[model samples]
Target: MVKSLQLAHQLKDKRILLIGGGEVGLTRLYKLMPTGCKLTLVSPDLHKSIIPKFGKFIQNKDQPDYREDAKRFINPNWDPTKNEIYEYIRSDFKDEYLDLENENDAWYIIMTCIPDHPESARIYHLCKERFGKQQLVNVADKPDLCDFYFGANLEIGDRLQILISTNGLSPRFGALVRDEIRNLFTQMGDLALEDAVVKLGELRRGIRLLAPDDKDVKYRMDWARRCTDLFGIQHCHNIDVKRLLDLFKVMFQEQNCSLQFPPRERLLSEYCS
Candidate 1:
């Protein structure tokens, strides 16, 4: 069986339509909001926690206090600030709501978290017919209909992210594995892997500028890769970048890519310095 190709998606400012406003929908909203997507949620009823939690950030045409239905749970202290990106439409799912007429504002992704199986199946088929097969659609708890599955992800600082997936077979198992990896890294102590990633990024860019010639491309990349491998990820953060780059210059220019790398003993010894 072929495995799903994993990837990172950029969703900032993209239009996402979420169908359902109950518990499942609320969970999806929580996950989608941080990605900065322009979210429009459609449902006949709102969850009790939705307003109390995210009421201030939601853009409502009529304030909750003024709307007869929402007034029941409206907080008198609610003070909305400028330009919130979330939109809420209190209604059942409608094909027209998909904005078929306005292709420019067409939804980039559609997610359904409702329990009605027949309605969910109809929405899935309707989306395929109207939006074409290329549209990204996700039906929560229905693996065969979903185009992609969300992996259980672990983030370390700003740079390092590890995602574990079980091909939608067992989410809890994937989460368990994610926790195991997290604990392993925590026990390994302050490797500062994020700092190493940043330093390596700078190293790559610096090498490209220093060896701009097309012929030196292979040597440049190999040297950097080899250095990273030999330095060991656990201690890469301790690398003395200035000294490493100086050595790179010598190996590339002075020796014309013929000289070998310094021994790991010397490299690690100097790394600490």
Candidate 2:
């Protein structure tokens, strides 16, 4: 069974490998490039149209190089203008593809996008055997062989990314859910919500400093819930942090132990047998 886990990784200056150059592989590489990873693409030949887009960036400046009829190209500096460096190597992925050796040389992620299912499966097994169990691998169209599945990710900023995944059941379904979330978030406006969360975190920290006890923590959480329900999130934003905290403390003290705390419900005579 596939499980979800939060992952934190530095994409800048990391080495990544793509084992195919088909449409899916190309799409994935384009997505990864902006994140600042040194990407190496391995494929026999890519679509002719893709070559012109790279222009001068292609490894062989004058002519395309090939090994045993397979094309080869490498991009050593993806961002030459800013002095940022990334390497891209294009060749038929084989056991001797120098890039595949030592697996430990700093490749944090690997993606397999070959069309042949058997070949993709074989590569997945080889990667596991070579890299042990820590490395992350994504095999397109074959979730069973993938250690990680690519989901629809919406980025409000560098600090926030909302991911939608249906456990690989259907990519289209995941995209639909992601669209709904995007609409909701657009209505809410991420910047405002993030600011509110920052203020709330600071308020919680101040309360902890003033009263470092479990009772205070519970009371604060309870008060937060009630305030959220009473004033509503949009209205709560108008209240200053200090005032909110003071009001919360007062409410907690007043509501702690009255007989009204837990009102018992009695069944009607018709329902009672």
Candidate 3:
């Protein structure tokens, strides 16, 4: 058994390269786009359908403003700040692509979706050799040769995110299971999610507003426990936060104290003096 540490990447405005604009590249592209990474796609010839969805333009390293023209896709997701700084290069991958200097702050990540395994493996080895194995690279559909695998992820903005992985055991199956979980959430009804979120926010916020002292009110632990009790009152059904805070304030007045405890101490009374 091997232990693999899991982490979420903060990829905003980072450099990412995708080689091959076929189905795999497009699928991976959608994942990267939402994170606003500065993405560059490399392929010899893209499919005709790609032109409409992402707009069509061709360029190379020699042309003036070549990089600028390619990013002007008519796609709606290419807006600044909110979405990815999309780029495209209609060219074949080369050894020069790995010439990323300033290793400390170089290309954030790279991925290859080319269906050719031997070629992809050769490129992978070359990249690892040139960059000394620290370079982040993922070879799509070939997990054994990759530094990381893109797991199936479900997200609701920054509020909620669910991730599933198989540790290279079976990504396809993981994807299938991930979809089932998402559909299950959908079947659980939309009103429950909305109501629960409202109740959750109010119950959490009330605890923070619990005053330490109000002349004669014992409002520390008793209020905290009352807030905890209110937490159980509502679920995905019948969530009312309008008068919840007002209801708890006038109902109880007990000296609430000592929920948190100090660290262990076994010293004699005269030891410190």
Q: Write the per-residue lDDT of candidate 2 for residues 1-273, one digit (tens) a residue.
A: 856775646677677877876788667865675677666667766655445544245544346555564344445445533222244445557865535456557578888888888888878787777777786788897768888767887866566777777754778998898888778767875345565577668667655654436755676566555544444444444436676555445445565521122111221111111
Candidate 3: what lDDT?
0.62
Mind sharing the TM-score for model 3? 0.66
Cα-based TM-score, every candidate:
0.80, 0.67, 0.66
Query: What ranges in model 1 sit over 4 Å off?
Result: 57-85, 191-198, 201-212, 253-266
Question: What is the clash count of model 3?
Answer: 0
lDDT agreement of model 1 with the native: 0.76
Q: How many residue pairs clash in each candidate?
A: 0, 0, 0
Q: State the weakest 10-residue window (summed lDDT) of model 1.
A: 74-83
Models ranked on lDDT: 1, 3, 2
Candidate 3 residues 6-67, lDDT tens each?
67888886878788888887787668777767777777766654555553443333556644
Give the alpha-carbon lDDT of every model: 0.76, 0.61, 0.62
Alpha-carbon RMSD, candidate 1: 4.7
Tens digits of per-residue lDDT, candidate 1, 1-273, equal: 678888777777777888988998888866676676766778877787775565554445365355555512222332222112266666788887787445678788999988897898899999999989998999988887899987788876656777788853678899899999999888887878777878888788777778756986898879988988888878788877778888888889889884478888888988543
User: What shift in Å separates residue 88 of candidate 3 from its native position after superposition?
Assistant: 1.9
Question: What TM-score would you give candidate 1 relative to the actual structure?
Answer: 0.80
lDDT of 2: 0.61
